[model samples]
Target: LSDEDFKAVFGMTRSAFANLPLWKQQHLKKEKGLF
Candidate 1:
């Protein structure tokens, strides 16, 4: 899927994801790959 398609599937954008704390982003980065 393309980035927009993935974002639609996941219901989040990089901007939205950035709303999360750095620690949380770090955890997700590992769990979800590059993130």
Candidate 2:
């Protein structure tokens, strides 16, 4: 999956995720890996 795919799967749009709770953001970013 591409970067967009990660966003789609994890429910984020970069800025949106940045605002998301750190706990959730951490999991999403980590699951995507090396983003």
Candidate 3:
């Protein structure tokens, strides 16, 4: 892919994570433990 296309795809992938709910994002990282 061209440089511009690579950037666009990268941005889209990044924003996809950004668009996820905050709670779900944290869960993906296992940021906190629940007991």
Candidate 4:
């Protein structure tokens, strides 16, 4: 999917993800790949 698609589908921003707990962010990043 495109970057816009990624964002739209995930509904998470870099800043918003960064604001999440480290473990949660890492979990999402690991599963998503190159987020």
Per-candidate clashes, comma-separated: 0, 0, 0, 0
Q: How far in Å is the alpha carbon of 10 misplaced in model 4?
A: 3.2
Instruction: Tell me the lDDT of candidate 3.
Output: 0.52
Compared with the true structure, all predictions reach lDDT values of 0.71, 0.71, 0.52, 0.69
Winner on lDDT (1 vs 3): 1
> Candidate 3's residue-wise lDDT over 1-35, tens digit each?
35465346444454565787888766643643321
**Per-residue alpha-carbon lDDT of candidate 4 for residues 1-35, written as tens digits (9 for 90 to 100):** 56676577558766666788989876776787744
Please, what are the lDDT tens digits per residue for candidate 1 over residues 1-35?
Answer: 47796577547886887898989877766766655
Which 10 successive residues of model 4 have the least lDDT summed?
1-10
Report the Cα lDDT for candidate 2.
0.71
Better of 2 and 4 by TM-score: 4
* Model 3 root mean square deviation, Cα atoms: 9.6
| TM-score for candidate 3 | 0.39
TM-score, structure 4 vs. true: 0.50
Model 1 TM-score on a 0 to 1 scale: 0.56
TM-score of each: 0.56, 0.43, 0.39, 0.50
> Pick by TM-score: which candidate is best?
1
